[PDB]
């Protein structure tokens, strides 16, 4: 109702987050980066093949439950 | 086999007698569904106090987390409430400061949901 499930994947590591529609995605990208022992700015985060700024929230991107956020390496 | 599936289904549906029968027959008390939710997770989510108690008494992992990093304490603090269930979880060793992947404690969930009593009991 106030929360949404998202999956962040890089092709080999998949993480499910249950986060508020109003929470910024900076924490989600940060958690995904930390679990790989990297910083968030080293990774490209894409929704619908479009990059995501950290300040944006799932409500700001019209996202739905079970939506996928792809993760790649900067300068891939 | 399928005893864990029946136990999860009964925890969802609120059958205490079926839960006890399945545990006596050897159902996995820590069996998880596709989202990683234990029967304790579902029971705390749906406000099933007796099922929560009997699972904790059968050795259910109170600190077990789903795929979102949410413990049964997280799910009980969220949405509905039922302060009795969070109290029983805490008395059975629920990690009050348990954080999900992005660091949401059950206290943060209670504060966001404005459940007052759960927030003060979480202390």
PDB file of N, CA and C in Angstrom, chain B residues 10-115:
ATOM      1  N   UNK B  10      -1.345 -22.920   6.097  1.00  0.00           N
ATOM      2  CA  UNK B  10      -2.128 -22.817   7.325  1.00  0.00           C
ATOM      3  C   UNK B  10      -1.786 -21.548   8.096  1.00  0.00           C
ATOM      4  N   UNK B  11      -0.504 -21.173   8.129  1.00  0.00           N
ATOM      5  CA  UNK B  11      -0.119 -19.922   8.774  1.00  0.00           C
ATOM      6  C   UNK B  11      -0.748 -18.731   8.066  1.00  0.00           C
ATOM      7  N   UNK B  12      -0.814 -18.782   6.734  1.00  0.00           N
ATOM      8  CA  UNK B  12      -1.533 -17.761   5.979  1.00  0.00           C
ATOM      9  C   UNK B  12      -3.010 -17.743   6.354  1.00  0.00           C
ATOM     10  N   UNK B  13      -3.629 -18.922   6.425  1.00  0.00           N
ATOM     11  CA  UNK B  13      -5.075 -19.036   6.562  1.00  0.00           C
ATOM     12  C   UNK B  13      -5.560 -18.976   8.004  1.00  0.00           C
ATOM     13  N   UNK B  14      -4.664 -19.033   8.981  1.00  0.00           N
ATOM     14  CA  UNK B  14      -5.079 -18.969  10.372  1.00  0.00           C
ATOM     15  C   UNK B  14      -5.760 -20.205  10.921  1.00  0.00           C
ATOM     16  N   UNK B  15      -5.264 -21.393  10.579  1.00  0.00           N
ATOM     17  CA  UNK B  15      -5.716 -22.641  11.189  1.00  0.00           C
ATOM     18  C   UNK B  15      -4.708 -23.053  12.255  1.00  0.00           C
ATOM     19  N   UNK B  16      -5.064 -22.843  13.523  1.00  0.00           N
ATOM     20  CA  UNK B  16      -4.172 -23.240  14.608  1.00  0.00           C
ATOM     21  C   UNK B  16      -4.120 -24.757  14.750  1.00  0.00           C
ATOM     22  N   UNK B  17      -5.273 -25.421  14.630  1.00  0.00           N
ATOM     23  CA  UNK B  17      -5.311 -26.875  14.748  1.00  0.00           C
ATOM     24  C   UNK B  17      -4.497 -27.543  13.648  1.00  0.00           C
ATOM     25  N   UNK B  18      -4.644 -27.073  12.405  1.00  0.00           N
ATOM     26  CA  UNK B  18      -3.857 -27.624  11.305  1.00  0.00           C
ATOM     27  C   UNK B  18      -2.371 -27.339  11.487  1.00  0.00           C
ATOM     28  N   UNK B  19      -2.025 -26.157  12.005  1.00  0.00           N
ATOM     29  CA  UNK B  19      -0.620 -25.844  12.272  1.00  0.00           C
ATOM     30  C   UNK B  19      -0.044 -26.820  13.291  1.00  0.00           C
ATOM     31  N   UNK B  20      -0.781 -27.066  14.376  1.00  0.00           N
ATOM     32  CA  UNK B  20      -0.306 -27.997  15.395  1.00  0.00           C
ATOM     33  C   UNK B  20      -0.188 -29.412  14.840  1.00  0.00           C
ATOM     34  N   UNK B  21      -1.162 -29.836  14.030  1.00  0.00           N
ATOM     35  CA  UNK B  21      -1.115 -31.172  13.438  1.00  0.00           C
ATOM     36  C   UNK B  21       0.100 -31.307  12.527  1.00  0.00           C
ATOM     37  N   UNK B  22       0.345 -30.292  11.695  1.00  0.00           N
ATOM     38  CA  UNK B  22       1.464 -30.347  10.762  1.00  0.00           C
ATOM     39  C   UNK B  22       2.801 -30.340  11.494  1.00  0.00           C
ATOM     40  N   UNK B  23       2.923 -29.541  12.559  1.00  0.00           N
ATOM     41  CA  UNK B  23       4.149 -29.573  13.352  1.00  0.00           C
ATOM     42  C   UNK B  23       4.344 -30.932  14.012  1.00  0.00           C
ATOM     43  N   UNK B  24       3.268 -31.516  14.548  1.00  0.00           N
ATOM     44  CA  UNK B  24       3.377 -32.839  15.156  1.00  0.00           C
ATOM     45  C   UNK B  24       3.757 -33.895  14.128  1.00  0.00           C
ATOM     46  N   UNK B  25       3.372 -33.697  12.867  1.00  0.00           N
ATOM     47  CA  UNK B  25       3.740 -34.628  11.809  1.00  0.00           C
ATOM     48  C   UNK B  25       5.121 -34.352  11.228  1.00  0.00           C
ATOM     49  N   UNK B  26       5.778 -33.275  11.640  1.00  0.00           N
ATOM     50  CA  UNK B  26       7.127 -32.986  11.216  1.00  0.00           C
ATOM     51  C   UNK B  26       7.279 -31.940  10.135  1.00  0.00           C
ATOM     52  N   UNK B  27       6.381 -30.961  10.065  1.00  0.00           N
ATOM     53  CA  UNK B  27       6.523 -29.890   9.090  1.00  0.00           C
ATOM     54  C   UNK B  27       7.723 -29.016   9.433  1.00  0.00           C
ATOM     55  N   UNK B  28       8.400 -28.521   8.398  1.00  0.00           N
ATOM     56  CA  UNK B  28       9.556 -27.651   8.589  1.00  0.00           C
ATOM     57  C   UNK B  28       9.091 -26.322   9.173  1.00  0.00           C
ATOM     58  N   UNK B  29       9.415 -26.085  10.448  1.00  0.00           N
ATOM     59  CA  UNK B  29       9.002 -24.856  11.116  1.00  0.00           C
ATOM     60  C   UNK B  29       9.649 -23.629  10.488  1.00  0.00           C
ATOM     61  N   UNK B  30      10.782 -23.800   9.805  1.00  0.00           N
ATOM     62  CA  UNK B  30      11.463 -22.705   9.127  1.00  0.00           C
ATOM     63  C   UNK B  30      11.379 -22.821   7.609  1.00  0.00           C
ATOM     64  N   UNK B  31      10.366 -23.514   7.094  1.00  0.00           N
ATOM     65  CA  UNK B  31      10.161 -23.569   5.654  1.00  0.00           C
ATOM     66  C   UNK B  31       9.803 -22.188   5.121  1.00  0.00           C
ATOM     67  N   UNK B  32      10.329 -21.859   3.946  1.00  0.00           N
ATOM     68  CA  UNK B  32      10.134 -20.546   3.354  1.00  0.00           C
ATOM     69  C   UNK B  32       9.439 -20.677   2.006  1.00  0.00           C
ATOM     70  N   UNK B  33       8.606 -19.690   1.691  1.00  0.00           N
ATOM     71  CA  UNK B  33       7.903 -19.652   0.419  1.00  0.00           C
ATOM     72  C   UNK B  33       8.794 -18.990  -0.633  1.00  0.00           C
ATOM     73  N   UNK B  34       8.214 -18.661  -1.789  1.00  0.00           N
ATOM     74  CA  UNK B  34       9.005 -18.108  -2.884  1.00  0.00           C
ATOM     75  C   UNK B  34       9.580 -16.740  -2.539  1.00  0.00           C
ATOM     76  N   UNK B  35       8.904 -15.978  -1.683  1.00  0.00           N
ATOM     77  CA  UNK B  35       9.409 -14.685  -1.240  1.00  0.00           C
ATOM     78  C   UNK B  35      10.318 -14.793  -0.023  1.00  0.00           C
ATOM     79  N   UNK B  36      10.598 -16.006   0.449  1.00  0.00           N
ATOM     80  CA  UNK B  36      11.445 -16.192   1.609  1.00  0.00           C
ATOM     81  C   UNK B  36      10.750 -16.038   2.941  1.00  0.00           C
ATOM     82  N   UNK B  37       9.422 -15.970   2.956  1.00  0.00           N
ATOM     83  CA  UNK B  37       8.683 -15.775   4.195  1.00  0.00           C
ATOM     84  C   UNK B  37       8.474 -17.106   4.907  1.00  0.00           C
ATOM     85  N   UNK B  38       8.833 -17.147   6.184  1.00  0.00           N
ATOM     86  CA  UNK B  38       8.584 -18.299   7.037  1.00  0.00           C
ATOM     87  C   UNK B  38       7.128 -18.297   7.487  1.00  0.00           C
ATOM     88  N   UNK B  39       6.631 -19.413   8.035  1.00  0.00           N
ATOM     89  CA  UNK B  39       5.282 -19.375   8.623  1.00  0.00           C
ATOM     90  C   UNK B  39       5.158 -18.344   9.727  1.00  0.00           C
ATOM     91  N   UNK B  40       6.246 -18.080  10.455  1.00  0.00           N
ATOM     92  CA  UNK B  40       6.250 -16.988  11.421  1.00  0.00           C
ATOM     93  C   UNK B  40       6.032 -15.645  10.733  1.00  0.00           C
ATOM     94  N   UNK B  41       6.680 -15.435   9.583  1.00  0.00           N
ATOM     95  CA  UNK B  41       6.495 -14.196   8.831  1.00  0.00           C
ATOM     96  C   UNK B  41       5.027 -13.980   8.483  1.00  0.00           C
ATOM     97  N   UNK B  42       4.403 -14.985   7.865  1.00  0.00           N
ATOM     98  CA  UNK B  42       3.014 -14.857   7.437  1.00  0.00           C
ATOM     99  C   UNK B  42       2.076 -14.721   8.629  1.00  0.00           C
ATOM    100  N   UNK B  43       2.330 -15.477   9.700  1.00  0.00           N
ATOM    101  CA  UNK B  43       1.472 -15.405  10.878  1.00  0.00           C
ATOM    102  C   UNK B  43       1.538 -14.030  11.530  1.00  0.00           C
ATOM    103  N   UNK B  44       2.740 -13.458  11.640  1.00  0.00           N
ATOM    104  CA  UNK B  44       2.866 -12.116  12.195  1.00  0.00           C
ATOM    105  C   UNK B  44       2.238 -11.078  11.274  1.00  0.00           C
ATOM    106  N   UNK B  45       2.335 -11.288   9.959  1.00  0.00           N
ATOM    107  CA  UNK B  45       1.761 -10.337   9.012  1.00  0.00           C
ATOM    108  C   UNK B  45       0.241 -10.278   9.124  1.00  0.00           C
ATOM    109  N   UNK B  46      -0.408 -11.428   9.301  1.00  0.00           N
ATOM    110  CA  UNK B  46      -1.863 -11.515   9.288  1.00  0.00           C
ATOM    111  C   UNK B  46      -2.482 -11.438  10.678  1.00  0.00           C
ATOM    112  N   UNK B  47      -1.688 -11.153  11.704  1.00  0.00           N
ATOM    113  CA  UNK B  47      -2.226 -11.030  13.048  1.00  0.00           C
ATOM    114  C   UNK B  47      -2.732 -12.322  13.653  1.00  0.00           C
ATOM    115  N   UNK B  48      -2.006 -13.422  13.460  1.00  0.00           N
ATOM    116  CA  UNK B  48      -2.384 -14.728  14.002  1.00  0.00           C
ATOM    117  C   UNK B  48      -1.538 -14.968  15.246  1.00  0.00           C
ATOM    118  N   UNK B  49      -2.090 -14.585  16.399  1.00  0.00           N
ATOM    119  CA  UNK B  49      -1.315 -14.562  17.635  1.00  0.00           C
ATOM    120  C   UNK B  49      -0.946 -15.971  18.082  1.00  0.00           C
ATOM    121  N   UNK B  50      -1.926 -16.878  18.086  1.00  0.00           N
ATOM    122  CA  UNK B  50      -1.692 -18.232  18.577  1.00  0.00           C
ATOM    123  C   UNK B  50      -0.737 -18.998  17.672  1.00  0.00           C
ATOM    124  N   UNK B  51      -0.854 -18.813  16.356  1.00  0.00           N
ATOM    125  CA  UNK B  51       0.070 -19.469  15.436  1.00  0.00           C
ATOM    126  C   UNK B  51       1.485 -18.941  15.641  1.00  0.00           C
ATOM    127  N   UNK B  52       1.624 -17.630  15.852  1.00  0.00           N
ATOM    128  CA  UNK B  52       2.931 -17.057  16.167  1.00  0.00           C
ATOM    129  C   UNK B  52       3.505 -17.709  17.420  1.00  0.00           C
ATOM    130  N   UNK B  53       2.691 -17.800  18.479  1.00  0.00           N
ATOM    131  CA  UNK B  53       3.153 -18.414  19.722  1.00  0.00           C
ATOM    132  C   UNK B  53       3.609 -19.846  19.494  1.00  0.00           C
ATOM    133  N   UNK B  54       2.764 -20.653  18.850  1.00  0.00           N
ATOM    134  CA  UNK B  54       3.043 -22.078  18.722  1.00  0.00           C
ATOM    135  C   UNK B  54       4.232 -22.323  17.802  1.00  0.00           C
ATOM    136  N   UNK B  55       4.431 -21.472  16.790  1.00  0.00           N
ATOM    137  CA  UNK B  55       5.625 -21.597  15.964  1.00  0.00           C
ATOM    138  C   UNK B  55       6.875 -21.255  16.761  1.00  0.00           C
ATOM    139  N   UNK B  56       6.826 -20.179  17.555  1.00  0.00           N
ATOM    140  CA  UNK B  56       7.977 -19.840  18.387  1.00  0.00           C
ATOM    141  C   UNK B  56       8.285 -20.955  19.378  1.00  0.00           C
ATOM    142  N   UNK B  57       7.246 -21.602  19.908  1.00  0.00           N
ATOM    143  CA  UNK B  57       7.442 -22.687  20.861  1.00  0.00           C
ATOM    144  C   UNK B  57       7.945 -23.959  20.191  1.00  0.00           C
ATOM    145  N   UNK B  58       7.771 -24.083  18.879  1.00  0.00           N
ATOM    146  CA  UNK B  58       8.265 -25.230  18.131  1.00  0.00           C
ATOM    147  C   UNK B  58       9.673 -25.017  17.594  1.00  0.00           C
ATOM    148  N   UNK B  59      10.301 -23.892  17.913  1.00  0.00           N
ATOM    149  CA  UNK B  59      11.649 -23.613  17.473  1.00  0.00           C
ATOM    150  C   UNK B  59      11.780 -22.752  16.237  1.00  0.00           C
ATOM    151  N   UNK B  60      10.732 -22.026  15.850  1.00  0.00           N
ATOM    152  CA  UNK B  60      10.814 -21.173  14.673  1.00  0.00           C
ATOM    153  C   UNK B  60      11.851 -20.077  14.877  1.00  0.00           C
ATOM    154  N   UNK B  61      12.616 -19.800  13.825  1.00  0.00           N
ATOM    155  CA  UNK B  61      13.650 -18.772  13.878  1.00  0.00           C
ATOM    156  C   UNK B  61      12.988 -17.402  13.945  1.00  0.00           C
ATOM    157  N   UNK B  62      13.033 -16.778  15.124  1.00  0.00           N
ATOM    158  CA  UNK B  62      12.397 -15.477  15.302  1.00  0.00           C
ATOM    159  C   UNK B  62      13.117 -14.405  14.490  1.00  0.00           C
ATOM    160  N   UNK B  63      14.429 -14.540  14.312  1.00  0.00           N
ATOM    161  CA  UNK B  63      15.230 -13.552  13.603  1.00  0.00           C
ATOM    162  C   UNK B  63      15.390 -13.865  12.118  1.00  0.00           C
ATOM    163  N   UNK B  64      14.672 -14.859  11.602  1.00  0.00           N
ATOM    164  CA  UNK B  64      14.752 -15.182  10.184  1.00  0.00           C
ATOM    165  C   UNK B  64      14.234 -14.022   9.343  1.00  0.00           C
ATOM    166  N   UNK B  65      14.892 -13.779   8.213  1.00  0.00           N
ATOM    167  CA  UNK B  65      14.541 -12.684   7.322  1.00  0.00           C
ATOM    168  C   UNK B  65      14.145 -13.226   5.956  1.00  0.00           C
ATOM    169  N   UNK B  66      13.217 -12.530   5.305  1.00  0.00           N
ATOM    170  CA  UNK B  66      12.779 -12.901   3.965  1.00  0.00           C
ATOM    171  C   UNK B  66      13.779 -12.370   2.937  1.00  0.00           C
ATOM    172  N   UNK B  67      13.396 -12.411   1.659  1.00  0.00           N
ATOM    173  CA  UNK B  67      14.271 -11.923   0.600  1.00  0.00           C
ATOM    174  C   UNK B  67      14.458 -10.412   0.648  1.00  0.00           C
ATOM    175  N   UNK B  68      13.545  -9.685   1.288  1.00  0.00           N
ATOM    176  CA  UNK B  68      13.674  -8.245   1.464  1.00  0.00           C
ATOM    177  C   UNK B  68      14.425  -7.878   2.736  1.00  0.00           C
ATOM    178  N   UNK B  69      14.956  -8.863   3.457  1.00  0.00           N
ATOM    179  CA  UNK B  69      15.595  -8.593   4.727  1.00  0.00           C
ATOM    180  C   UNK B  69      14.636  -8.314   5.857  1.00  0.00           C
ATOM    181  N   UNK B  70      13.363  -8.665   5.698  1.00  0.00           N
ATOM    182  CA  UNK B  70      12.341  -8.358   6.690  1.00  0.00           C
ATOM    183  C   UNK B  70      12.136  -9.555   7.610  1.00  0.00           C
ATOM    184  N   UNK B  71      12.334  -9.335   8.904  1.00  0.00           N
ATOM    185  CA  UNK B  71      12.044 -10.322   9.931  1.00  0.00           C
ATOM    186  C   UNK B  71      10.553 -10.311  10.242  1.00  0.00           C
ATOM    187  N   UNK B  72      10.049 -11.324  10.957  1.00  0.00           N
ATOM    188  CA  UNK B  72       8.643 -11.261  11.390  1.00  0.00           C
ATOM    189  C   UNK B  72       8.339 -10.042  12.241  1.00  0.00           C
ATOM    190  N   UNK B  73       9.334  -9.507  12.952  1.00  0.00           N
ATOM    191  CA  UNK B  73       9.135  -8.256  13.676  1.00  0.00           C
ATOM    192  C   UNK B  73       8.838  -7.110  12.714  1.00  0.00           C
ATOM    193  N   UNK B  74       9.568  -7.049  11.596  1.00  0.00           N
ATOM    194  CA  UNK B  74       9.295  -6.049  10.567  1.00  0.00           C
ATOM    195  C   UNK B  74       7.853  -6.140  10.086  1.00  0.00           C
ATOM    196  N   UNK B  75       7.408  -7.353   9.753  1.00  0.00           N
ATOM    197  CA  UNK B  75       6.073  -7.531   9.197  1.00  0.00           C
ATOM    198  C   UNK B  75       4.990  -7.252  10.229  1.00  0.00           C
ATOM    199  N   UNK B  76       5.242  -7.586  11.496  1.00  0.00           N
ATOM    200  CA  UNK B  76       4.258  -7.327  12.540  1.00  0.00           C
ATOM    201  C   UNK B  76       4.154  -5.842  12.862  1.00  0.00           C
ATOM    202  N   UNK B  77       5.269  -5.108  12.797  1.00  0.00           N
ATOM    203  CA  UNK B  77       5.207  -3.670  13.039  1.00  0.00           C
ATOM    204  C   UNK B  77       4.543  -2.930  11.883  1.00  0.00           C
ATOM    205  N   UNK B  78       4.587  -3.496  10.680  1.00  0.00           N
ATOM    206  CA  UNK B  78       4.038  -2.840   9.504  1.00  0.00           C
ATOM    207  C   UNK B  78       2.528  -3.036   9.425  1.00  0.00           C
ATOM    208  N   UNK B  79       1.866  -2.087   8.761  1.00  0.00           N
ATOM    209  CA  UNK B  79       0.442  -2.165   8.445  1.00  0.00           C
ATOM    210  C   UNK B  79      -0.452  -2.285   9.675  1.00  0.00           C
ATOM    211  N   UNK B  80      -0.979  -3.488   9.918  1.00  0.00           N
ATOM    212  CA  UNK B  80      -2.092  -3.656  10.850  1.00  0.00           C
ATOM    213  C   UNK B  80      -1.698  -3.292  12.279  1.00  0.00           C
ATOM    214  N   UNK B  81      -0.738  -4.015  12.854  1.00  0.00           N
ATOM    215  CA  UNK B  81      -0.409  -3.809  14.254  1.00  0.00           C
ATOM    216  C   UNK B  81      -0.390  -5.072  15.092  1.00  0.00           C
ATOM    217  N   UNK B  82      -1.359  -5.211  16.002  1.00  0.00           N
ATOM    218  CA  UNK B  82      -1.423  -6.326  16.951  1.00  0.00           C
ATOM    219  C   UNK B  82      -0.183  -6.345  17.853  1.00  0.00           C
ATOM    220  N   UNK B  83      -0.109  -5.298  18.685  1.00  0.00           N
ATOM    221  CA  UNK B  83       0.996  -5.109  19.625  1.00  0.00           C
ATOM    222  C   UNK B  83       1.307  -6.360  20.447  1.00  0.00           C
ATOM    223  N   UNK B  84       0.316  -7.224  20.672  1.00  0.00           N
ATOM    224  CA  UNK B  84       0.584  -8.466  21.390  1.00  0.00           C
ATOM    225  C   UNK B  84       1.580  -9.337  20.635  1.00  0.00           C
ATOM    226  N   UNK B  85       1.480  -9.374  19.304  1.00  0.00           N
ATOM    227  CA  UNK B  85       2.366 -10.228  18.517  1.00  0.00           C
ATOM    228  C   UNK B  85       3.802  -9.721  18.571  1.00  0.00           C
ATOM    229  N   UNK B  86       4.004  -8.405  18.452  1.00  0.00           N
ATOM    230  CA  UNK B  86       5.367  -7.897  18.567  1.00  0.00           C
ATOM    231  C   UNK B  86       5.900  -8.122  19.976  1.00  0.00           C
ATOM    232  N   UNK B  87       5.043  -8.022  21.001  1.00  0.00           N
ATOM    233  CA  UNK B  87       5.507  -8.315  22.358  1.00  0.00           C
ATOM    234  C   UNK B  87       5.961  -9.764  22.491  1.00  0.00           C
ATOM    235  N   UNK B  88       5.175 -10.705  21.960  1.00  0.00           N
ATOM    236  CA  UNK B  88       5.556 -12.114  22.045  1.00  0.00           C
ATOM    237  C   UNK B  88       6.836 -12.372  21.261  1.00  0.00           C
ATOM    238  N   UNK B  89       6.988 -11.721  20.107  1.00  0.00           N
ATOM    239  CA  UNK B  89       8.217 -11.864  19.335  1.00  0.00           C
ATOM    240  C   UNK B  89       9.418 -11.364  20.127  1.00  0.00           C
ATOM    241  N   UNK B  90       9.290 -10.186  20.745  1.00  0.00           N
ATOM    242  CA  UNK B  90      10.392  -9.626  21.524  1.00  0.00           C
ATOM    243  C   UNK B  90      10.733 -10.511  22.716  1.00  0.00           C
ATOM    244  N   UNK B  91       9.712 -11.032  23.403  1.00  0.00           N
ATOM    245  CA  UNK B  91       9.956 -11.920  24.534  1.00  0.00           C
ATOM    246  C   UNK B  91      10.668 -13.195  24.094  1.00  0.00           C
ATOM    247  N   UNK B  92      10.484 -13.602  22.840  1.00  0.00           N
ATOM    248  CA  UNK B  92      11.115 -14.798  22.302  1.00  0.00           C
ATOM    249  C   UNK B  92      12.426 -14.499  21.585  1.00  0.00           C
ATOM    250  N   UNK B  93      12.970 -13.296  21.756  1.00  0.00           N
ATOM    251  CA  UNK B  93      14.276 -12.976  21.221  1.00  0.00           C
ATOM    252  C   UNK B  93      14.293 -12.282  19.879  1.00  0.00           C
ATOM    253  N   UNK B  94      13.248 -11.532  19.539  1.00  0.00           N
ATOM    254  CA  UNK B  94      13.236 -10.807  18.275  1.00  0.00           C
ATOM    255  C   UNK B  94      14.244  -9.667  18.313  1.00  0.00           C
ATOM    256  N   UNK B  95      15.073  -9.581  17.276  1.00  0.00           N
ATOM    257  CA  UNK B  95      16.048  -8.502  17.169  1.00  0.00           C
ATOM    258  C   UNK B  95      15.310  -7.192  16.918  1.00  0.00           C
ATOM    259  N   UNK B  96      15.257  -6.335  17.939  1.00  0.00           N
ATOM    260  CA  UNK B  96      14.500  -5.092  17.830  1.00  0.00           C
ATOM    261  C   UNK B  96      15.136  -4.165  16.799  1.00  0.00           C
ATOM    262  N   UNK B  97      16.466  -4.139  16.738  1.00  0.00           N
ATOM    263  CA  UNK B  97      17.195  -3.267  15.828  1.00  0.00           C
ATOM    264  C   UNK B  97      17.568  -3.961  14.522  1.00  0.00           C
ATOM    265  N   UNK B  98      16.857  -5.026  14.157  1.00  0.00           N
ATOM    266  CA  UNK B  98      17.151  -5.727  12.914  1.00  0.00           C
ATOM    267  C   UNK B  98      16.889  -4.817  11.721  1.00  0.00           C
ATOM    268  N   UNK B  99      17.862  -4.740  10.819  1.00  0.00           N
ATOM    269  CA  UNK B  99      17.791  -3.868   9.656  1.00  0.00           C
ATOM    270  C   UNK B  99      17.602  -4.696   8.394  1.00  0.00           C
ATOM    271  N   UNK B 100      16.788  -4.185   7.475  1.00  0.00           N
ATOM    272  CA  UNK B 100      16.658  -4.791   6.157  1.00  0.00           C
ATOM    273  C   UNK B 100      17.848  -4.355   5.302  1.00  0.00           C
ATOM    274  N   UNK B 101      17.768  -4.584   3.988  1.00  0.00           N
ATOM    275  CA  UNK B 101      18.906  -4.287   3.124  1.00  0.00           C
ATOM    276  C   UNK B 101      19.264  -2.804   3.155  1.00  0.00           C
ATOM    277  N   UNK B 102      18.263  -1.926   3.221  1.00  0.00           N
ATOM    278  CA  UNK B 102      18.513  -0.488   3.241  1.00  0.00           C
ATOM    279  C   UNK B 102      18.405   0.089   4.653  1.00  0.00           C
ATOM    280  N   UNK B 103      18.324  -0.764   5.670  1.00  0.00           N
ATOM    281  CA  UNK B 103      18.441  -0.313   7.045  1.00  0.00           C
ATOM    282  C   UNK B 103      17.160   0.144   7.707  1.00  0.00           C
ATOM    283  N   UNK B 104      16.045  -0.527   7.438  1.00  0.00           N
ATOM    284  CA  UNK B 104      14.774  -0.223   8.084  1.00  0.00           C
ATOM    285  C   UNK B 104      14.607  -1.179   9.255  1.00  0.00           C
ATOM    286  N   UNK B 105      14.618  -0.637  10.465  1.00  0.00           N
ATOM    287  CA  UNK B 105      14.268  -1.410  11.640  1.00  0.00           C
ATOM    288  C   UNK B 105      12.752  -1.493  11.764  1.00  0.00           C
ATOM    289  N   UNK B 106      12.237  -2.476  12.507  1.00  0.00           N
ATOM    290  CA  UNK B 106      10.789  -2.493  12.769  1.00  0.00           C
ATOM    291  C   UNK B 106      10.298  -1.230  13.452  1.00  0.00           C
ATOM    292  N   UNK B 107      11.154  -0.576  14.241  1.00  0.00           N
ATOM    293  CA  UNK B 107      10.780   0.693  14.858  1.00  0.00           C
ATOM    294  C   UNK B 107      10.520   1.764  13.807  1.00  0.00           C
ATOM    295  N   UNK B 108      11.349   1.812  12.759  1.00  0.00           N
ATOM    296  CA  UNK B 108      11.116   2.764  11.677  1.00  0.00           C
ATOM    297  C   UNK B 108       9.785   2.494  10.989  1.00  0.00           C
ATOM    298  N   UNK B 109       9.467   1.217  10.767  1.00  0.00           N
ATOM    299  CA  UNK B 109       8.190   0.858  10.161  1.00  0.00           C
ATOM    300  C   UNK B 109       7.022   1.283  11.041  1.00  0.00           C
ATOM    301  N   UNK B 110       7.131   1.056  12.353  1.00  0.00           N
ATOM    302  CA  UNK B 110       6.070   1.467  13.268  1.00  0.00           C
ATOM    303  C   UNK B 110       5.903   2.981  13.276  1.00  0.00           C
ATOM    304  N   UNK B 111       7.016   3.719  13.250  1.00  0.00           N
ATOM    305  CA  UNK B 111       6.946   5.178  13.235  1.00  0.00           C
ATOM    306  C   UNK B 111       6.285   5.668  11.952  1.00  0.00           C
ATOM    307  N   UNK B 112       6.671   5.093  10.810  1.00  0.00           N
ATOM    308  CA  UNK B 112       6.073   5.497   9.540  1.00  0.00           C
ATOM    309  C   UNK B 112       4.586   5.169   9.497  1.00  0.00           C
ATOM    310  N   UNK B 113       4.203   3.998  10.006  1.00  0.00           N
ATOM    311  CA  UNK B 113       2.802   3.600  10.028  1.00  0.00           C
ATOM    312  C   UNK B 113       2.024   4.235  11.173  1.00  0.00           C
ATOM    313  N   UNK B 114       2.702   4.912  12.096  1.00  0.00           N
ATOM    314  CA  UNK B 114       2.019   5.630  13.163  1.00  0.00           C
ATOM    315  C   UNK B 114       1.209   4.751  14.090  1.00  0.00           C
ATOM    316  N   UNK B 115       1.760   3.611  14.496  1.00  0.00           N
ATOM    317  CA  UNK B 115       1.041   2.669  15.343  1.00  0.00           C
ATOM    318  C   UNK B 115       1.248   2.931  16.831  1.00  0.00           C
TER     319      UNK B 115
END
